[PDB]
């Protein structure tokens, strides 16, 4: 497994019951968010760790056909059956780098 891209972002999940975003893992702050590629089965996943204490706040697969939504210039999002993930990037450049890596990953799947 190899990191193909990384960006700084505050990782959020959507609390549908209350119609609100909450910090992934319980506390607000920036994480280093990677896309990892695993050879052999050709899989990708997003893995993010809090800069402060290395808490893993996101670890989710990227399936073929995932719909990655660039809601704003610095907030991007996607879903699975259980929850909706959001990345609040530290800059538009961080967001564009991550998005381009994600979209190219979806082309390799």
């Amino acid at each position: 497994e190899q990191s193909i891209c990384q960006a700084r972002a505050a990782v959020m999940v959507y609390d549908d019951a209350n119609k609100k975003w909450v910090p992934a893992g319980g506390s607000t702050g920036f994480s280093r968010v990677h896309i990892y590629h695993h050879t052999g089965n050709n899989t990708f996943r997003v893995v993010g760790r809090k800069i402060q204490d290395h808490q893993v706040v996101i670890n989710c697969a990227i399936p073929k056909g995932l719909k990655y939504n660039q809601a704003t210039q610095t907030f991007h999002q996607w879903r699975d059956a259980r929850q909706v993930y959001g990345l609040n990037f530290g800059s538009k450049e961080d967001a564009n780098v991550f998005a381009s890596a994600m979209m190219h990953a979806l082309e390799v799947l």
């Binding site: 959507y14 119609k19 704003t72 907030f75 999002q77 879903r79 909706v84």
Partner: peptide
Amino acid sequence: XPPX
């Protein structure tokens, strides 16, 4: 997707 939900809004921000």
